[model samples]
Target chain A: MEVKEVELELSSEATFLSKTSIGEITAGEKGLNPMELLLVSIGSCSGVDVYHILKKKRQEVKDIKIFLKGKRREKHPKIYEEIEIKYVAVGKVEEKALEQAVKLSTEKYCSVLAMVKPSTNLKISWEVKWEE
Target chain B: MEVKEVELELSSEATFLSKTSIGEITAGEKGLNPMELLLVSIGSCSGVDVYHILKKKRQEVKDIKIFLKGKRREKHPKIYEEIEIKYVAVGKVEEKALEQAVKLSTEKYCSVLAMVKPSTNLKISWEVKWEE
Candidate 1:
């Protein structure tokens, strides 16, 4: 069984820091808040999968951008009730390829979204902007 | 009606970058991977809640450290099946206070955990070290 682990430190001064085998993240003062971090986790996971899939499809991808907007319930658990994601790619890639990649990411890959989808409503949109 | 939004950029070079109103996070060669980022999101959210609650309780907290270990399901989507969290506090504090803070975080306050709890099993433990 493969296990993943990470560590976080919260100093008395209220600073947040975390480390994994790959790298480190810090928060507070000038960094992501908890909710923001959660959103970014989802966006980045989706972005990586989308980018990797487009590359595998031999699309002339130049760049990928992900935008996430999440609305939380106005109560104690306050979990995200609805999330909208827009995937934009700058390249001469086929629209079909971009759509396929986004589909695969939202439905098959993107671990972060998979975890949250059971509890949240997700709306996904995509676009491929042609670049010379 | 309040909403949280974030943006992530994946350059053609496969670099991952995200920005919220508060700050920015970058990934890839020198940053956290997708899974790692997910785990950190969980840990840091819990840490912030625990630390803040302890401070509000007037505990002499010097530092708070969180350790998280997660095991993913062996299937497509590969979501986290189990996660173990340990909270260690350095200070001359009451163990009971630490316990209360941790309980509040795990049960009520940690948004990330609340979002993921439906899909993941979580085990939490805590300790307080005496300091002069």
Candidate 2:
């Protein structure tokens, strides 16, 4: 499959007298601070791919929720030691199909997580709850 | 001195099929994801204190810029290894007095950095380039 890249910039100014400021934001913050950005990045990246995969299998999806929890060192230079992502979906999706979709995303489709994984510990899990 | 605390809650839903989400934003994310929030937090927290301190010291101020550069581990559980905060000011102020003001904020006034330091590597630096 073909791939694409996105770019962003962040800047800020000091509003008060302490040690922080209000400036522009950056890509590094996408994964670090606004982790949702990372999630959105991964979700969008794999979301498109997984939706297509599931659709091709004739599976219908109503909604999907991706929950991520990460553990980081409490000391200086804190980095994500491990991350757990839970995928919960409601619809007529089958367990097998969901599993396959997840596998494809992690192993082949999701590039954001893949890029950060070599330098960080990453793990994923999923649950399928059919919606009436 | 007296102290007060604030609390917040964040929730989100995983959109698409990836490993991230479109849920609520949390306080941790406030400091991590929306780093501007961290800046705002420090700015406001110290802003009030420093403004008051300056007021008492009878120092006239115009604008201040607090630039923070932090280095982190490139590996798992990335944490801030070192942080440098540069404070730039534009006003009719004495170099020695500005230096003393910064020292006071970092050593005696700024509490946020202090709280996070024991758990992470934190450093502070400053500059007082008068505005032309």
Candidate 3:
């Protein structure tokens, strides 16, 4: 019985802006397009999950990076048909820990991933790195 | 045969940042959360459509605004169970034209909307306003 909400304002000049109880979002020429924002939603959702999971597991995780690529259908609507996600962790994090974190994020905790799972061909991979 | 891509970087301090060919996104305490970004994607996607549609119809659309509310389940992977959207347009635009634009965006053009439709309960409403 919990609800999460957000608001968006499209300016008279057609600039896109969004607000929540926490912060705001800007889009268009100086910002991300809608499609890009969608990817952000998926990536950030997972990023938060993985980062916290590793921390809670007491892993030597220094930084986390996620890369995503999405392929859209050819016709109208042009929804994402395929998506590939790669997670790279910096520092002395263990390979097994990174794998478990990624698995848990995508499979168990990332709400955005769950929302898009039924429609997207999602592929995930992970690696441990020592630097950015 | 088109593709869209995005990338995210998480600092050791857990700051969420995203990058595209266009620009970047920062999330966390100073920016929109992942869930809020999802709503932004939906609203902006429709905002772009409605604004342009009004222009094409020769309507004097001075501005456009969209609002959204999403309700989530109370368990893990609590994806949106219900969503409500409202479009508030400014200027001398016809209600019919605005309706058509929203309809086209949600039913045919918006990839984000299309992706979420099957999984979320979506309700839409719109109005014509003169200010803000």
Candidate 4:
């Protein structure tokens, strides 16, 4: 498959922009700092996994929301040492599906999750919540 | 060392709040999307490494910046396939120091860099510019 690309331009004091399909958006300053964005990546990457998995399972997909809590080392180069993800799914879905989906995303599907796993102690669990 | 932490709350689809030392910042609407933020994490993670390493080497520090370009596969996963990082340093520092810093950060210091290396074909290079 041909790859889609992301371009980053650096501004002063940790600010940047990306030329996305929708439009341009900035980060740093009042926008999300780098580390916060990192947390979102871990969650969102896995969320994408669950979305596809649920669709293949023929479940009604309403929404997938993930919450992340990350702990970093106190020393310099504060990389995440521990990460916890709370996965929430809203719609007509089976409990078995949710469990399997989370398992697959964390263990196999999500590339970001696997990368950080070696360095950060990752703890993931989920719940089924309805939007309506 | 005790791990300092980062927390994320999902407000809407692709929007979130992060509890940081400075203040709360939003994402996903007019702000950076998940993928864009991921790029920042990679750059900033290494940028921090350079900043600290140069400091310890007694190089009078001025500024540090990095630029990134990423390519993702066209498939549903859309994960990065090729990532290129351009590091820039501004100060009265030695070229050898900058080179060592880059090598140490990419090869050792930056956990984020290490994690993504396996999945993505990463390309990192740098330059030095003084602000005078």
Best by DockQ: 3
lDDT score, candidate 4, position B75: 56
A31-113: candidate 4 lDDT, tens digit per residue:
44556667766766676677778778987767666778777776545567788788777888787898899998888777556
Indicate the worst ten consecutive residues by lDDT in candidate 2 chain B: B1-10
In candidate 3 the C-alpha lDDT for residue A28 amounts to: 48
User: Model 3 off-target regions past 4 Å?
Assistant: A12-14, A130-132, B130-132
C-alpha positional error of residue B100 in candidate 3 after TM-score superposition, expressed in Å = 0.7
| Per-residue lDDT of candidate 2, residues A83-129 (tens digit) | 56667666899989988988887776553444445545667788888
lDDT of 3: 0.81
Question: In model 2, what is the error at residue A12, expressed in angstroms?
Answer: 4.3
Instruction: Kindly list the per-residue Cα lDDT of model 3 for residues B1-132, writing each as its tens digit.
Output: 577888778743556778877767686434567887888888888777887778899888767778898898788899999989999888887789889999998999888888888888999999987542
Task: Tell how far residue B43 is off in model 2, in angstroms.
Answer: 20
Q: What local lDDT does model 3 show for residue A27?
A: 64
Cα-based lDDT for every prediction = 0.81, 0.47, 0.81, 0.67
lDDT of 2 by residue, B58-79 (tens): 6566655555554544552233
Off by over 4 Å in 4: A1-33, A51-64, A71-81, A90-93, A107-109, A118-120, B4-31, B55-63, B73-79, B91-93
Which one wins by lDDT: 3 or 4?
3
Better of 1 and 2 by DockQ: 1
